[PDB]
Amino acid sequence: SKPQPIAAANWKCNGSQQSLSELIDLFNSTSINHDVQCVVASTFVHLAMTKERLSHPKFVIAAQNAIAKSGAFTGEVSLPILKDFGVNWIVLGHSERRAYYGETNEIVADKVAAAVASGFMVIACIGETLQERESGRTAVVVLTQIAAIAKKLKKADWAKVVIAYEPVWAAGTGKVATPQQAQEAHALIRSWVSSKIGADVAGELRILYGGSVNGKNARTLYQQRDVNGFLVGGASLKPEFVDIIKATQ
Amino acid sequence: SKPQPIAAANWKCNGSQQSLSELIDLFNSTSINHDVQCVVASTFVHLAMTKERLSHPKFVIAAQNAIAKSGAFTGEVSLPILKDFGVNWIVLGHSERRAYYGETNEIVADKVAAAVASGFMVIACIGETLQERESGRTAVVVLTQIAAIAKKLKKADWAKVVIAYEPVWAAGTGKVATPQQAQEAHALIRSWVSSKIGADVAGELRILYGGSVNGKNARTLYQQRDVNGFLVGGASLKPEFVDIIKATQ
């Protein structure tokens, strides 16, 4: 059987206290009858209200970024501060932070290693841009990204790691990933993990699809062998997210 | 007389729920007999707790950073999110963000302009490094930083602007800034604001000192004509911060 699935909401830099409370109320009233870990990654500001008001036992809260240590880093939030706040999940290496906020493969890898060392479950993001895919460089780009992460982990650390594959090449470019394309990318990742880390690790690793997913297409995506759930963007701010959760049966 | 002073606590990337709760209780218990605006700039994570627990009527709460607009910017917090969260003050362009997190003069200027346009009070940070000061380039660097900010503002906008001068050249470099050196920098800034914006704006602009401020040296720094308060770092995490507040007369 496939490993336990994950349905993660990446709210990105969005939400009002009122609009997000509506979503949390919906989640609290949702019947989830199978084993799936649901994750709500809100902005730092909204963690207080999500921690307080989420009552559904299958949900955990998550941060969308951090730096490794507390200190003289005005504007940033550290892993120790998040752990003290009760936050045990984190999304790291998102394509938007790789593109906009200076996160090289090695900076992402050090953040993931610090987060694992600090007791987080880590959703580590990798994926290639349209420039990189159109020039036939999916494999070099994606394997280089996960290899950089792997160099700062030991085998036992992968129990705390989740990989999200972002098809950045299909992000607002009008291009679209088929489920077969997503499976092929996930299969590439799992093959590397099996060979470099171990077949035992690869067998239980969650690889989440981080492309455009909605209530309509989620079930078809999840039926691919190497898809273990989702890191959802825009649909995670919509009632639609419930359908993405139930699609991981 | 000098304009209303500001005593701003930049907690930076620091704090536990317990440690900040105890610090807030001390601030709540503090009697402040003179007219001064106190500011607590916490991490994004701690804004809810600070909103709940900080009750001293001479204190307001500030963020330490933001981006201009909500949207697909994973890990970041936007001005509309902060305004929905009841946060109306913000520190922008801190030397640590100019150093580590890609904030050029122009990026700082655009963030300040968006914050003013969104109704924030803005503590906008400028200041030169050791290499810049020793190269004779204090004036060129600091006035170029504030010029980039100023070119996006109309005269009326300066009612919402506070300048913080950071002597980065004395921040863990083995150098110490004297009250006379602080005065010289503040006078330089005010003179430029007078010449380029207006004598009326310059007369009432708060220019805060953002170097090493503690309970000892605060009083001698505030005695200078053109020092209007402090953006306090390490000492703002300590009881010592109340003495810095009381040194603003």
Hey, are the CB atoms on B75 and A64 less than 8 Å from each other?
Answer: yes
Sequence-distant (6+) residues with CB within 8 A of B128 are B137, B138, B141, B142, B167, B168, B169
Hey, are the CB atoms on B72 and A13 less than 8 Å from each other?
Answer: yes
Distance, CA of A33 to chain centre: 22
- For residues A167 and A155, is the Cβ–Cβ distance under 8 A? no
Method: X-ray
Distance from CA of A41 to the nearest CA of B (A): 9
Paired sense of beta strands B207-209 and B89-92, if any: unpaired
Binding residues of B for substrate: 10, 12
Hey, are the CB atoms on B13 and A44 less than 8 Å from each other?
Answer: no
Helix, strand, or coil here: B128?
coil
CA A192/CA B136 separation, integer angstroms: 55
Residue B1's H or E segment, with its range, is none
DSSP A149: H
Residue A184's H or E segment, with its range, is helix A179-196
What angle do the packed helices B179-196 and B138-150 form, to 10 degrees?
40
DSSP B205: -
Hey, are the CB atoms on B12 and A101 less than 8 Å from each other?
Answer: no
Helix, strand, coil percent values for chain B (each to nearest 5): 45, 15, 40
Task: Compute CA distances B34 → B7, B8, B164, B228, whole Å.
Answer: 12, 15, 21, 14
CA B125/CA B10 separation, integer angstroms: 12
Burial of A150 (0-12, 13-18, 19+ CB in 10 A): buried
CA A22/CA B178 separation, integer angstroms: 54
Domain count, chain A: 1
- For residues B162 and B60, is the Cβ–Cβ distance under 8 A? no
Residue A226's H or E segment, with its range, is none
CATH number at residue B44: 3.20.20.70
What angle do the packed helices A179-196 and A138-151 form, to 10 degrees?
40
* Residue linked to tokens 């150098």: B175
Nearest alpha-carbon partner for A108 in A91, A98, A93, A126:
A93
Query: What is the 3-state secondary structure of B44-112?
Result: HHHHHHHHHHCCCCCEEEEECCCECCCECCCCCCEHHHHHHCCCCEEEECCHHHHHHCCCCHHHHHHHH
Cα torsion through A12, A14, A18, A21, rounded to 10: -10
Task: Compute CA distances B207 → A26, A164, A166, B183, B219, whole Å.
Answer: 48, 46, 46, 10, 16
Helix, strand, or coil here: A67?
strand
- The two three-digit tokens of residue B164, written as one number: 């913080």
Nearest alpha-carbon partner for A249 in A61, A62, A20, A4:
A4
Write out the catalytic residue numbers of A.
94, 166
CA A120/CA A161 separation, integer angstroms: 9
> Pick from A67, A81, A96: which is nearest to B74 by CB?
A96
> Pick from B49, B65, B73: which is nearest to A96 by CB?
B73
Contacts of B84 in chain A (CB under 8 A): 16-17
A164-173 in b/e burial notation, b at 16+ Cβ within 10 A?
bbbbbbbbee
Sequence-distant (6+) residues with CB within 8 A of A197 are A150, A155, A158
CA B234/CA B213 separation, integer angstroms: 8
CA A240/CA B135 separation, integer angstroms: 59
Nearest alpha-carbon partner for A242 in A50, A16, A92, A40:
A40
B185-188: list long-range contacts, CB under 8 Å, 24+ apart.
B185/B127, B185/B138, B185/B142, B186/B224, B186/B226, B186/B227, B186/B228, B187/B225, B187/B226, B188/B138, B188/B139, B188/B142, B188/B143
Paired sense of beta strands A6-10 and A37-41, if any: parallel
CA A168/CA A171 separation, integer angstroms: 5
Range(s) of the domain holding residue B160: 1-249
- For residues B245 and B38, is the Cβ–Cβ distance under 8 A? yes
Burial of B211 (0-12, 13-18, 19+ CB in 10 A): buried
